[PDB]
Amino acid sequence: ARPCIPKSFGYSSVVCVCNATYCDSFDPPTPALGTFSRYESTRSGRRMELSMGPIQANHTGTGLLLTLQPEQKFQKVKGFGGAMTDAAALNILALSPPAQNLLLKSYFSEEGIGYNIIRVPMASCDFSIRTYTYADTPDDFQLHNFSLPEEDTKLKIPLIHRALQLAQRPVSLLASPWTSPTWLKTNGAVNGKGSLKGQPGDIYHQTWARYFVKFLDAYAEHKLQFWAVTAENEPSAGLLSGYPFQCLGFTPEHQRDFIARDLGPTLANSTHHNVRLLMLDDQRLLLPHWAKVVLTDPEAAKYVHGIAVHWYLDFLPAKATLGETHRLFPNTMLFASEACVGSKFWEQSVRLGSWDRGMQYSHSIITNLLYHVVGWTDWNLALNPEGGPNWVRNFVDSPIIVDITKDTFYKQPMFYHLGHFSKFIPEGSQRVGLVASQKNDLDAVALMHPDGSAVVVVLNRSSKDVPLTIKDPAVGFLETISPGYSIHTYLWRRQ
Ligand SMILES: *[C@@H]1O[C@H](CO)[C@@H](O[C@@H]2O[C@H](CO)[C@@H](O)[C@H](O)[C@H]2NC(C)=O)[C@H](O)[C@H]1NC(C)=O
Numbered sequence: 001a002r003p004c005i006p007k008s009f010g011y012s013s014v015v016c017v018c019n020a021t022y023c024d025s026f027d028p029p030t031p032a033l034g035t036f037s038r039y040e041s042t043r044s045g046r047r048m049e050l051s052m053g054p055i056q057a058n059h060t061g062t063g064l065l066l067t068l069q070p071e072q073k074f075q076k077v078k079g080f081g082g083a084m085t086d087a088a089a090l091n092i093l094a095l096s097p098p099a100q101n102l103l104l105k106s107y108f109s110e111e112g113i114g115y116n117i118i119r120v121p122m123a124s125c126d127f128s129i130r131t132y133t134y135a136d137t138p139d140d141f142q143l144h145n146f147s148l149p150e151e152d153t154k155l156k157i158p159l160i161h162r163a164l165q166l167a168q169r170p171v172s173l174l175a176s177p178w179t180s181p182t183w184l185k186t187n188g189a190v191n192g193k194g195s196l197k198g199q200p201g202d203i204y205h206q207t208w209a210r211y212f213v214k215f216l217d218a219y220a221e222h223k224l225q226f227w228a229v230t231a232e233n234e235p236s237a238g239l240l241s242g243y244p245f246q247c248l249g250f251t252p253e254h255q256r257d258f259i260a261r262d263l264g265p266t267l268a269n270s271t272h273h274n275v276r277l278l279m280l281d282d283q284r285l286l287l288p289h290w291a292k293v294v295l296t297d298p299e300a301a302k303y304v305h306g307i308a309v310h311w312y313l314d315f316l317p318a319k320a321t322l323g324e325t326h327r328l329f330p331n332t333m334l335f336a337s338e339a340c341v342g343s344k345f346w347e348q349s350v351r352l353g354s355w356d357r358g359m360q361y362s363h364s365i366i367t368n369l370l371y372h373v374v375g376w377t378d379w380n381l382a383l384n385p386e387g388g389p390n391w392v393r394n395f396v397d398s399p400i401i402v403d404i405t406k407d408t409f410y411k412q413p414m415f416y417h418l419g420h421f422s423k424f425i426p427e428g429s430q431r432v433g434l435v436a437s438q439k440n441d442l443d444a445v446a447l448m449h450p451d452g453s454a455v456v457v458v459l460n461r462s463s464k465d466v467p468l469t470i471k472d473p474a475v476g477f478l479e480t481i482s483p484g485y486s487i488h489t490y491l492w493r494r495q
């Protein structure tokens with residue numbers, strides 16, 4: 001174990017300072033039947049502290065009671081992680097090797113928060129320091145000059161390998177393109193309003209479908225295989241006049257037909273047919289309409305494994321989107337493929353120590369779990385103090401901020417708020433019921449670990465301490481209390 005080295009930067013909480021020779025860490029997971037484990041993080045400085053208490057056989061009183069519903073079974077969990085963008089890899093590798101390993105350990109190791117997903121962009125997005133695709137030779141329909149640049153061969157891929165080496169959980173890779181080569185596009189530019197030329201089934205559309213295959217082929221050459229790909233990052237962006245950075249517009253009908261006609265068959269007839277395809281990969285406000293358009297066409301649906309969703313954590317309904325969508329296509333998983341904060345005009349892109357941005361992460365993770373979402377992926381794994389680099393200056397926050405000049409990195413509250421989920425909810429976990437005995441201000445979600453034991457996260461975004469008890473009929477009652485401005489993960493064995 002190693003405790004947080006705290007440092008204040010003038011906001012509501014501290015960051016934990018890590019460097020080449022030190023970084024906060026866990027002991028390996030260890031609790032007997034009849035006892036419960038509690039991980040606590042507080043605005044006042046506690047960082048996933050471990051403590052244990054007994055489970056009571058009896059309970060008197062009329063304070064808040066949350067009853068576990070073991071037998072109400074909801075979605076199963078895919079996992080948790082972040083994006084290996086050019087900017088993140090760039091920042092990580094600018095540190096000294098020993099510090100690089102602590103950073104990777106904090107995310108990917110049982111000594112850290114056990115991430116098991118990595119989103120990887122296919123070529124450049126806005127967190128890149130130059131625009132480029134894998135096929136920048138014009139009119140190269142055959143993709144003869146398709147190749148991975150150094151951004152993949154010297155930064156992302158090696159970093160990915162090391163993450164996998166460090167992880168004990170099996171890790172899944174997820175890939176998303178921002179833009180195709182510009183000669184495949186009506187506007188001939190990496191950004192701006194513009195889409196694939198011609199129409200689905202045609203040679204522009206076939207070339208693009210093969211580009212996915214070539215991407216996967218090249219990655220498979222560096223011994224990496226993907227769990228899933230998205231059909232396109234924020235397809236809706238490329239429909240917007242003057243959109244500032246890399247994009248490719250699809251209407252839902254364009255996406256439907258492109259999937260049915262080109263990308264589905266192409267992927268299916270290739271050695272990567274077990275790779276899953278997710279559609280949308282955009283704001284949840286495009287639901288349920290996008291889902292309806294794509295899935296009620298059997299020729300497209302037969303290829304679509306799930307629906308990927310984005311969150312701008314600064315803004316903010318979910319039931320009329322996630323809810324309705326799940327209702328309509330219960331067997332098509334919802335998956336959060338991107339989240340983030342740092343745009344509220346009045347506040348810095350990176351606020352070091354921000355407990356509020358922390359709360360925003362887990363509040364969102366919980367709302368997602370409550371609406372059937374099966375996994376959650378943060379945006380940039382790491383960023384500099386300015387919130388980049390980003391070639392369009394589109395800076396934002398990241399759970400780990402790298403300070404190259406001091407060979408230091410900072411773990412923000414956000415990190416720990418993620419940790420309260422990622423570290424304790426392995427793939428296979430199943431969300432189950434948790435009913436409250438009365439209106440309260442807590443946020444809480446309960447799941448069952450594959451092994452049969454229980455996880456419950458309780459978040460408290462008010463300033464008041466909230467005393468409460470959790471009933472599980474198999475074992476008894478957890479008397480506990482939830483400190484204002486805190487998040488707890490509770491674990492206890494069930495048989
Ligand atoms: C990395 O950070 C660690 C932890 O803060 C630093 O080690 C501390 O250094 C100061 C000054 O030497 C001591 O007062 C503390 O007792 C140390 N803590 C521990 C547990 O060693 C170390 O200085 C940092 N490394 C660099 C290069 O700055």
Ligand SMILES: *[C@@H]1O[C@H](CO)[C@@H](O)[C@H](O)[C@H]1NC(C)=O
Binds near residue numbers: 137144145
């Ligand atoms: C494309 O590849 C060919 C052979 O594969 C190579 O000789 C040539 O330099 C490349 N053409 C361009 C435009 O780079």
